Amino acid sequence: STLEMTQPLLEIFRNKADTRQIAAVVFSTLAFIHNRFHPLVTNFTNKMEFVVTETNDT
Amino acid sequence: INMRRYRNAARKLIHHYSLNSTSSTEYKISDVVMTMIFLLRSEKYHSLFKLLETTFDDYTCRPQMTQVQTDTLLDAVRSLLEMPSTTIDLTTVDIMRSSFARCFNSPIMRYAKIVLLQNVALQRDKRTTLEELLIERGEKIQMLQPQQYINSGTEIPFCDDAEFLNRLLKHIDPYPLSRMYYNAANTMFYTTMENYAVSNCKFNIEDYNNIFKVMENIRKHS
Amino acid sequence: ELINMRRYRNAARKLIHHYSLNSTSSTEYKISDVVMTMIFLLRS
């Protein structure tokens, strides 16, 4: 809810509309797990882009 | 002639063999017979009915439909599942057909022969291996740049009002529990073996057996 | 006049297929190739 008032999930993941929200979902969920397993080291710096792929061949 | 009832069984059978078959003990030979009768009645679907009856260890001169005919067939399929949100690839349907072939080739009786297998009928005359997964490789990934990165909504958010979140929780309390898993987690991530649709490298029970020995540690070490 | 519209179209079609479906980068293919694509499209 804090994350930009997360919008309807399955279609938000559908439709190839915008990579941005997909990447944000991924990053935020990963940070959430990081925090749950240990709040002691709250986060991790390294920036990067991320890949979507569109083929069974992967 | 309860065409209605027969259809009602049929749709269940369709879902049971296709996907997300949350149901249990769906199988009933009388019911599938009613399905076949419904198909016969379905003049519009006679194409699919004949295709399905064709299921035997011969299968030379497959239907060889024109793409138009295949499209109309998919239209029928969606109109008959009445859950059209996707058109599945024909190959899943042919795989269910192969399962029906197993059903035919079965003098199998009171013994509780659960099929207890993922059918290997997806083949395209190819062979596949786990270390060969490294050869399937991410050379493609190297050939693609990742789409983008940006700082917006940036960095490290944190939790909202506990009391408001309890307000929301109260809507969650009514719902059952762990049946959600038994539906979604069980079915979905079992059937993820569908990924072997790529020239069917065999599944390996072994690593899935991780689950007990890995989760046990919580209790084992308090 | 002499132009190999044939091979140009061939590579161009192959290009457009994979490119428009991958929606992403084309390390196998070259600027010369997209150029011939637009050349075909001008002459056709």
Side-chain angles (χ1 to χ4, degrees):
Chain A
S1 73
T2 60
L3 290 162
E4 308 189 341
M5 299 290 280
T6 296
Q7 298 72 14
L9 167 58
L10 279 79
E11 284 298 327
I12 281 283
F13 185 64
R14 203 186 191 174
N15 316 303
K16 286 75 63 174
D18 181 16
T19 64
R20 184 188 174 277
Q21 281 62 243
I22 318 307
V25 160
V26 171
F27 202 114
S28 56
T29 313
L30 297 161
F32 186 87
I33 300 158
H34 186 96
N35 282 271
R36 196 209 76 90
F37 186 74
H38 44 48
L40 321 176
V41 187
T42 59
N43 67 91
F44 34 78
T45 316
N46 295 336
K47 276 65 178 173
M48 59 291 293
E49 311 187 310
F50 287 91
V51 174
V52 193
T53 174
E54 324 316 318
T55 183
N56 52 274
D57 308 311
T58 57
Chain B
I1 327 167
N2 201 354
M3 73 304 283
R4 181 179 157 287
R5 170 165 78 174
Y6 315 154
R7 183 186 53 271
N8 307 353
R11 67 204 176 191
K12 308 163 187 175
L13 183 74
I14 302 171
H15 194 74
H16 156 280
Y17 273 110
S18 58
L19 53 88
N20 299 261
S21 304
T22 301
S23 188
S24 181
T25 183
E26 195 279 352
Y27 80 91
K28 297 303 158 4
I29 62 175
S30 182
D31 302 5
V32 299
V33 168
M34 290 188 290
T35 312
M36 304 307 99
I37 306 151
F38 190 57
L39 272 158
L40 175 58
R41 182 179 167 282
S42 309
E43 73 295 12
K44 51 174 172 165
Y45 302 160
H46 277 177
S47 52
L48 178 49
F49 177 44
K50 290 195 168 186
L51 183 160
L52 296 165
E53 197 287 335
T54 310
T55 307
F56 297 104
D57 56 310
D58 299 325
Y59 200 55
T60 295
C61 303
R62 295 190 297 272
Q64 177 40 26
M65 285 172 280
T66 72
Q67 185 175 6
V68 179
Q69 296 147 10
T70 65
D71 305 336
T72 63
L73 179 62
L74 299 160
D75 311 337
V77 170
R78 272 172 284 86
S79 82
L80 194 53
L81 182 61
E82 304 97 350
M83 315 178 187
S85 298
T86 190
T87 305
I88 311 299
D89 69 79
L90 73 172
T91 64
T92 65
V93 185
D94 202 324
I95 289 158
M96 294 187 281
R97 181 196 66 85
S98 305
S99 64
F100 309 159
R102 302 176 171 263
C103 311
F104 283 180
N105 287 27
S106 293
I108 316 174
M109 208 193 64
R110 288 291 191 289
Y111 167 62
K113 188 193 171 186
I114 301 175
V115 163
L116 301 167
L117 56 92
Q118 186 181 12
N119 185 15
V120 187
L122 64 89
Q123 75 296 335
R124 303 296 181 270
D125 297 328
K126 305 294 163 292
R127 292 290 78 200
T128 51
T129 302
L130 305 186
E131 193 165 25
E132 278 47 34
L133 304 171
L134 184 57
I135 314 181
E136 309 308 324
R137 203 155 73 87
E139 76 295 18
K140 322 204 298 178
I141 313 306
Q142 313 327 303
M143 298 302 99
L144 262 65
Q145 180 60 20
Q147 286 80 353
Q148 55 81 13
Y149 158 68
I150 59 172
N151 296 62
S152 171
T154 311
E155 217 62 43
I156 299 150
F158 206 64
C159 307
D160 203 355
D161 170 32
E163 320 322 318
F164 165 76
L165 299 168
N166 307 327
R167 198 283 191 175
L168 273 48
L169 169 58
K170 301 149 197 180
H171 326 326
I172 317 178
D173 191 46
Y175 295 149
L177 199 59
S178 305
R179 286 69 170 84
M180 49 185 64
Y181 306 159
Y182 190 81
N183 296 319
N186 182 336
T187 308
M188 189 67 264
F189 309 113
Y190 177 83
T191 53
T192 185
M193 59 180 49
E194 64 211 328
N195 302 12
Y196 291 134
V198 182
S199 296
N200 54 289
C201 195
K202 71 174 186 177
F203 172 70
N204 312 282
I205 306 90
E206 292 60 40
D207 211 40
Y208 257 65
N209 306 116
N210 78 82
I211 304 154
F212 57 90
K213 222 178 180 185
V214 65
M215 172 51 198
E216 66 184 26
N217 312 292
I218 302 295
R219 296 190 174 203
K220 300 281 183 175
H221 317 84
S222 67
Chain C
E1 186 172 341
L2 185 58
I3 300 153
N4 191 333
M5 294 283 286
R6 299 176 182 177
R7 84 180 186 69
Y8 305 170
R9 182 194 166 281
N10 302 352
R13 171 187 183 114
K14 172 194 175 181
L15 161 60
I16 306 145
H17 171 95
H18 79 78
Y19 170 85
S20 71
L21 308 165
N22 299 323
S23 78
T24 51
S25 52
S26 189
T27 58
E28 156 173 37
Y29 308 75
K30 301 216 304 297
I31 299 87
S32 44
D33 321 335
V34 300
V35 162
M36 279 175 275
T37 313
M38 281 69 83
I39 291 173
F40 176 84
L41 295 171
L42 170 63
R43 182 60 57 81
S44 67

